[PDB]
Amino acid sequence: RISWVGEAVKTDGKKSYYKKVCIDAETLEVGDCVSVIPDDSSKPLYLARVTALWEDSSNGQMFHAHWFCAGTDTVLGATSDPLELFLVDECEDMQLSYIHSKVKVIYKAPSENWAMEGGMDPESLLEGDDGKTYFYQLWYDQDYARFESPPKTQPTEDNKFKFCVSCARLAEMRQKEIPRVLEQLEDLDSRVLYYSATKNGILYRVGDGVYLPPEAFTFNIKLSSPVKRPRKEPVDEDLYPEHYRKYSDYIKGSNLDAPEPYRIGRIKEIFCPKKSNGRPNETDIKIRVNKFYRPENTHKSTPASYHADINLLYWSDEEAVVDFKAVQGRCTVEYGEDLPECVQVYSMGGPNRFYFLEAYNAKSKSFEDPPNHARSKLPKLRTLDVFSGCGGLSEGFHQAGISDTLWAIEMWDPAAQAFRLNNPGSTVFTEDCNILLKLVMAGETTNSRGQRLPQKGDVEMLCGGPPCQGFSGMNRFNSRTYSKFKNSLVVSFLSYCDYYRPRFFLLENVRNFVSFKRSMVLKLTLRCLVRMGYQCTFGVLQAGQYGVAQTRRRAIILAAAPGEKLPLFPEPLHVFAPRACQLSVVVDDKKFVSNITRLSSGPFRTITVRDTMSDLPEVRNGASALEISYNGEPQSWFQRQLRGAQYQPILRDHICKDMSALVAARMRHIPLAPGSDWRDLPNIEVRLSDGTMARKLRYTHHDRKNGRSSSGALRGVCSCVEAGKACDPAARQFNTLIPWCLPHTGNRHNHWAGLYGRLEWDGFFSTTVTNPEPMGKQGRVLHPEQHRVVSVRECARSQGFPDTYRLFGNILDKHRQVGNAVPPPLAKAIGLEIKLCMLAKA
DNA sequence: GAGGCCGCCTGC
DNA sequence: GCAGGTGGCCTC
Ligand SMILES: CCc1c(C#N)c(S[C@@H](C(N)=O)c2ccccc2)nc(N2CCC(N)CC2)c1C#N
Numbered sequence: 106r107i108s109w110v111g112e113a114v115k116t117d118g119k120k121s122y123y124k125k126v127c128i129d130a131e132t133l134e135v136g137d138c139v140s141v142i143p144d145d146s147s148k149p150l151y152l153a154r155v156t157a158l159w160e161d162s163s164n165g166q167m168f169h170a171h172w173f174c175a176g177t178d179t180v181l182g183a184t185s186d187p188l189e190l191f192l193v194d195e196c197e198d199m200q201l202s203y204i205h206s207k208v209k210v211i212y213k214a215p216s217e218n219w220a221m222e223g224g225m226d227p228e229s230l231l232e233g234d235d236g237k238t239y240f241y242q243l244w245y246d247q248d249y250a251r252f253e254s255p256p257k258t259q260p261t262e263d264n265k266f267k268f269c270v271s272c273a274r275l276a277e278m279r280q281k282e283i284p285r286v287l288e289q290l291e292d293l294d295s296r297v298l299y300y301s302a303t304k305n306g307i308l309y310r311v312g313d314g315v316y317l318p319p320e321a322f323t324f325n326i327k328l329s330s331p332v333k334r335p336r337k338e339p340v341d342e343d344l345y346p347e348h349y350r351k352y353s354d355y356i357k358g359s360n361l362d363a364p365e366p367y368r369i370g371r372i373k374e375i376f377c378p379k380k381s382n383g384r385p386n387e388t389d390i391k392i393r394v395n396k397f398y399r400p401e402n403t404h405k406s407t408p409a410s411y412h413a414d415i416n417l418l419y420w421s422d423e424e425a426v427v428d429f430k431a432v433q434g435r436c437t438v439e440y441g442e443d444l445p446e447c448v449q450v451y452s453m454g455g456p457n458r459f460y461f462l463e464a465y466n467a468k469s470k471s472f473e474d475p476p477n478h479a480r481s482k483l484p485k486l487r488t489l490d491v492f493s494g495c496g497g498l499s500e501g502f503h504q505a506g507i508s509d510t511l512w513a514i515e516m517w518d519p520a521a522q523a524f525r526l527n528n529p530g531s532t533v534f535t536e537d538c539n540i541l542l543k544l545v546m547a548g549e550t551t552n553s554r555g556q557r558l559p560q561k562g563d564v565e566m567l568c569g570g571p572p573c574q575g576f577s578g579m580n581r582f583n584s585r586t587y588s589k590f591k592n593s594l595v596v597s598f599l600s601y602c603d604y605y606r607p608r609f610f611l612l613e614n615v616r617n618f619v620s621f622k623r624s625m626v627l628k629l630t631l632r633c634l635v636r637m638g639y640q641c642t643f644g645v646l647q648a649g650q651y652g653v654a655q656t657r658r659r660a661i662i663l664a665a666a667p668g669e670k671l672p673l674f675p676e677p678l679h680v681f682a683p684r685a686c687q688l689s690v691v692v693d694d695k696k697f698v699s700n701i702t703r704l705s706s707g708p709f710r711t712i713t714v715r716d717t718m719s720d721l722p723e724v725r726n727g728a729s730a731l732e733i734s735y736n737g738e739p740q741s742w743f744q745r746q747l748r749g750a751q752y753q754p755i756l757r758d759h760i761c762k763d764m765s766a767l768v769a770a771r772m773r774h775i776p777l778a779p780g781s782d783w784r785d786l787p788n789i790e791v792r793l794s795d796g797t798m799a800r801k802l803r804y805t806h807h808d809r810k811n812g813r814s815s816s817g818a819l820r821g822v823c824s825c826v827e828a829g830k831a832c833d834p835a836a837r838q839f840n841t842l843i844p845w846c847l848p849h850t851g852n853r854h855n856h857w858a859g860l861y862g863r864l865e866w867d868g869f870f871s872t873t874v875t876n877p878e879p880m881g882k883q884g885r886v887l888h889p890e891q892h893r894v895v896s897v898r899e900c901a902r903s904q905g906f907p908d909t910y911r912l913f914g915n916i917l918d919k920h921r922q923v924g925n926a927v928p929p930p931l932a933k934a935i936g937l938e939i940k941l942c943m944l945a946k947a
Numbered sequence: 948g949a950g951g952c953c954g955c956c957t958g959c
Numbered sequence: 960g961c962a963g964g965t966g967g968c969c970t971c
Pocket residue numbers: 577881882953954965966967
């Protein structure tokens with residue numbers, strides 16, 4: 106019933122291989138695809154390509170199965186084409202008895218004309234199926250949710266009869282995962298030194314720079330012990346009655362829990378211990394490095410980093426021995442005086458670049474010169490930016506050097522004007538993108554303004570952030586919400602992608618884009634891209650990890666045309682508060698992460714509010730002067746970068762809103778200490794600038810949950826503080842310095858922590874929003890010391906805008922332009938990944 | 948036009 | 960229970 110076809114081609118040990126076999130009516134050669142029934146008959150069939158056939162002398166006839174992955178098993182889930190399979194690196198040997206049948210599985214290769222085949226309607230993108238036999242077009246990575254073009258690994262001349270792409274690639278992966286040694290330098294008594302070694306695909310030579318975790322070594326400088334603030338001192342509970350609502354010690358925006366950045370070492374010796382016979386123990390690779398001092402690591406503590414470049418190091422003669430496995434990555438560390446180009450052109454010329462000028466001696470606590478033994482393009486993509494705003498994303502991409510935004514669609518006119526101001530020679534459309542795409546599809550050349558419409562082939566990269574009004578909830582889709590989504594700007598954007606078929610595609614959105622409607626918006630977006638034939642993936646980035654003093658998690662969908670390389674997500678550059686760095690995403694109770702490997706540390710120190718705005722001159726509440734004096738040079742590396750090279754005699758848009766007299770009193774009665782907000786307000790009468798009065802907040806009801814003051818006073822300001830009693834309108838009080846509504850509903854809003862909250866110089870911004878309001882959602886918008894709301898220029902700094910980036914409109918328009926924008930440092934990191942792909946194209 | 952006011956859901 | 964994430968709507 107099961108019989109071989111011929112004699113054996115190769116017999117090794119207990120196995121004997123054959124090329125063709127016969128099962129009960131059928132003949133199978135290596136290369137055919139088959140089906141296998143799981144032990145659970147309710148689960149669907151498994152499908153695999155046979156890669157080898159043989160017989161084991163103690164178990165019987167065997168074959169090697171390289172499994173396919175059903176589309177429902179990918180992140181696409183139920184939205185997958187019911188007949189679409191995906192190549193995966195999964196395989197196993199299995200008895201031929203498990204084979205159920207032979208199935209036809211076709212490879213649907215994109216045509217040479219793929220770029221012109223777009224134009225299918227949203228319904229055909231969302232729900233259209235292929236309508237043929239089993240087919241695959243893409244390889245799938247399950248831990249990163251990456252759909253990519255199938256690998257082109259070639260078969261051996263000695264291992265062709267039994268070759269398996271999956272086995273070959275898994276062996277490649279393991280062999281690059283294990284660290285090895287290379288050209289052997291010199292034999293010593295106790296160890297043997299090498300000139301080079303390799304780890305995770307990176308080549309480390311003697312003299313290269315290594316990233317190490319902060320635990321890898323310590324410095325000879327005594328890390329002088331700071332003092333955590335003693336227990337919260339008791340305050341006058343009748344003067345600051347709401348202070349009791351600060352029983353949590355957690356400070357929003359604080360960097361007290363932010364990790365330390367990497368240690369930087371220079372490889373002095375790569376070496377292995379010798380076995381007693383003299384041969385090296387090459388499974389135990391050690392390295393000897395010279396400790397580099399960051400400025401903040403010298404006897405001058407943290408303040409030494411306020412002015413220094415973020416990549417400035419101090420050479421030292423201290424040394425350390427660590428395990429090679431501890432190396433977190435390679436980096437360049439150059440002596441500045443020997444550098445061919447200037448220090449700025451160097452630092453801006455590539456990743457992981459550090460330089461040193463002086464040398465640090467901890468024993469002497471002095472800076473001297475380092476010993477002598479310490480010495481030794483391509484065309485931009487034409488880009489269409491949909492829902493551009495003032496152009497933060499386009500600016501970041503331009504800074505990466507990959508894009509010229511030739512076309513932008515922005516319906517809000519002041520943001521369109523700002524994008525024009527910053528991007529002359531780009532065509533900015535203010536029409537509905539649906540109207541534009543329909544005009545293009547109808548054969549139109551120009552819009553009603555005379556502007557030339559982008560045609561197929563003009564658009565080489567497509568990026569944008571589409572709003573998600575109507576379906577931004579978590580509840581499941583119904584008919585109404587699904588219709589609103591099918592007629593949505595997200596789907597319109599995908600239609601743009603399908604029509605123009607650019608080389609690269611980026612959808613940016615709020616973090617929760619990945620969870621909307623039980624992750625259905627995400628799943629349908631990926632489904633559309635796959636239906637177009639794109640390679641694609643998704644992930645969540647934290648903008649603060651790329652060089653801004655702000656927590657801003659954004660969702661990122663990346664797509665790359667067939668023939669391209671699918672970009673990686675950018676590795677974090679700066680350490681950041683870990684609680685602001687939850688980037689994982691759960692889809693159908695499966696956890697996906699990105700390719701990011703820097704989880705606990707990083708190469709650059711975190712950017713603080715001090716780095717962001719310590720150089721801006723003091724202004725009053727309601728500052729309106731559009732052009733003022735900086736009153737001095739930039740102070741931090743970040744300020745030098747954003748102010749730029751050419752000297753700027755004018756500081757622009759350092760204006761603030763003119764909050765009312767009551768709000769101004771409140772603000773100037775918020776303490777300057779970190780973590781201060783409305784709960785530290787005093788309960789006093791105060792006369793306002795308009796001569797009116799602000800009265801005490803009187804406590805009129807017993808909150809049995811929160812109790813009473815140390816003086817015995819009540820803590821409720823309304824009858825609703827009782828069990829089921831409703832709001833007595835007479836209990837509402839007006840023109841109180843302590844706003845009445847915050848104690849009124851604070852028990853169910855985490856005591857409205859952060860409202861009327863000050864920023865911290867050592868800390869970061871909460872998410873920069875379109876209109877900073879101290880009693881709104883994100884109400885931590887007060888200046889660290891000045892009695893005002895954060896300014897437009899300060900918000901721009903928190904978003905990482907260059908100071909020369911022109912805005913447009915009134916102050917609320919400009920706040921909104923800044924708030925809506927993608928932080929250019931984040932956009933630039935993504936763009937550099939895209940550039941990697943552009944450079945590494947076959 | 949600007950300020951007071953403040954639900955519902957999720958991950959832990 | 961705590962922290963985070965989403966602005967909009969009466970009202971004068
Ligand atoms: C934290 C303060 C707050 C916010 C905020 N940020 C909202 S955003 C909500 C809406 N406003 O529609 C919305 C939902 C979906 C999309 C866009 C906006 N909503 C709040 N609620 C007050 C009573 C209102 N009827 C609605 C619920 C509160 C509070 N407190």
